[PDB]
Amino acid sequence: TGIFMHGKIPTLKISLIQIFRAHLWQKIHESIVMDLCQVFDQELDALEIETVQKETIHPRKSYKMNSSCADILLFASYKWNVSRPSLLADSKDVMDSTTTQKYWIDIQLRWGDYDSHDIERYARAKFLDYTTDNMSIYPSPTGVLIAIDLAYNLHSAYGNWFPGSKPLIQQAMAKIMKANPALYVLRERIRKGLQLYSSEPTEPYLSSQNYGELFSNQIIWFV
Amino acid sequence: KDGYKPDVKIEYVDETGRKLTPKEAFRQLSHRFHGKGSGKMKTERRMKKLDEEALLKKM
C-alpha cells in the first residue's frame, strides 16, 4: 500500500490496515489503469492512436515510490509532436520542437497528509524526478504521469500532455474521480470505518402530479 | 490540439450486458485480481437471484 505512516500509532495503524483490507491498493491501481485504458480506447482512433497496450509492470511497481514505470504504452501511428511536460491544470499551449511516435502515460497513487495534499506540485516533482530516474526506465521520454491523492480525494498529472490528449486526460480523470469503482469501494470502506454515514434521501411524497404515478407495474399497497 | 469536446462515457457492464453494480463491479475486479471465481453455493445463489429478477421483469 501507499500509506507511508511516518510514525507508530497502533490505533491509527490498525485502522489504516483494516481500511485497506483484502489487498485493496494494488487492485485499485490496476482498476484505475484499466479504466484509463478503456476510456482512451473508446475514442482512441480519432485521437491518432495506433495500438494501446499496458506494459509489463511488476505488482510492487504500483506502490514503491523509489522505482516507477510506465502504465500505458499506446502507439500513435504518426510523428506525435512531444509537447513540453507541464501541469494539466495549465492553459498554456507551448510545445517544443520535439516529435516521436510512441507516447506513454503513467498513474501514481498517493495518500497525502495535511501538508502533502499539494497534488499538482508533488506530481510535477515526481514527473521531473522520473524523467531522470535511475531505475524508472520508461520507454517514451515523453511519458506523462498521473497522481491520485486518495487520502484527500484528488487527482493530477503534470507530464507531457500530448497534443489533443490533455482535455481527454482531464475528462477521463474527472469521470474516474466521480465514479471510479475501486475508489468508490475504498471511499465507502473509509466512511464505514470512521462511523460516518450521510443521511440517505427519503422517498418523495406523491403530490397531485404524482397521484397517477402509483398505477405502474410496480405493485403499490396503499397501507 | 485538434479541438473538440470529449465524447467519453465509460462503464463496467458484464459480458451478459447487465450493468454491474459498483459493489458488484468491485467484486468482479477483486475476483479478476485474485484470479478466483465464485463457488458452487455462490453460483447457485446467483442463478436463483437472476432467475427471480428475470421472472419479476417478465411481468
Binding site: 490496476e30 484499466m34 505488482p59 | 463496467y12 479478476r32 485480481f33 485474485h34
Partner: peptide, 26 residues
C-alpha cells in the same frame, strides 16, 4: 446512421494467485 455503442469487455489482468513470475504478463 445512429449512435451505436458497443462497450468491449474489460478483463482485468490477474494479480493474485498467478502462480507465475513476478512481473505482470502481457
Amino acid at each position: 446512421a445512429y449512435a451505436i455503442n458497443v462497450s468491449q469487455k474489460r478483463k482485468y489482468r490477474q494479480y493474485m494467485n498467478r502462480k507465475g513470475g513476478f512481473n505482470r504478463p502481457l
